[PDB]
Design a binder for this molecule. Structure first.
Ligand SMILES: CO[C@@H]1O[C@H](CO)[C@H](O)[C@H](O[C@@H]2O[C@H](CO)[C@@H](O)[C@H](O)[C@H]2NC(C)=O)[C@H]1O
Length: 167
């Protein structure tokens, strides 16, 4: 089986968080969302994840997209499985495989989770830059091996909480 146990709408990062020192801010996992338990799965269900970023691509760094928020501020974005180190660097605006997948035991149960992580980028200087709450994109479960979603909700959404960068 599969069922949806997570939340449809999800905020990334603490609201009105402040961060200090294209220039990339070292924010680690602070501007993140993580949930180990988004779908409940059982009895041989096989599932991975696709991610999609809806923000405009305004540049590229080391093979991943810089996504634009404002004239001064962009984002590097990762989506993936639960643990932050599993994140896949996002490029472009299409669905992208961000977790190859796994299969829960034929006789047992577990969950499928996810993580979204971003790091702010100064694209252009004015030295205090604020960003408002902004839709980022979505992640969808991707069944495989003949597993079926039925009509279970496949997709969850992410919004960037507002933040301020101090330079
Ligand atoms: C037998 O326990 C299960 O072990 C597998 C690895 O064999 C896996 O770690 C399972 O945990 C889930 O793993 C998912 C895919 O990595 C992940 O998306 C979920 O968050 C994990 N669910 C948890 C940690 O409760 C584990 O149940």
């Amino acid at each position: 089986a599969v069922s949806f146990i997570g939340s449809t709408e999800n905020d990334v990062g603490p609201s009105l968080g402040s961060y200090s020192r294209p220039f990339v801010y070292d924010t680690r996992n602070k501007i993140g969302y993580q949930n180990a338990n988004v779908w409940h799965i059982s009895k041989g269900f096989c599932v991975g994840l696709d991610g999609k970023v809806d923000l405009p691509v305004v540049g590229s760094l080391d093979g991943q997209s810089i996504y634009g928020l404002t004239e001064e501020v962009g984002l590097l974005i990762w989506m993936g499985d639960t643990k932050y180190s599993r994140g896949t660097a996002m490029s472009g605006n299409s669905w992208e495989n961000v977790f190859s997948g796994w299969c829960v035991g034929a006789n047992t149960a577990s969950t499928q989770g996810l993580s979204v992580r971003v790091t702010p980028v100064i694209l252009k200087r004015n030295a205090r830059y604020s960003v408002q709450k902004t839709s980022i994109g979505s992640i969808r479960m991707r069944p495989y091996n003949g597993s079926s979603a039925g009509s279970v909700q496949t997709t969850v959404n992410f919004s960037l909480n507002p933040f301020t960068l101090n330079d």
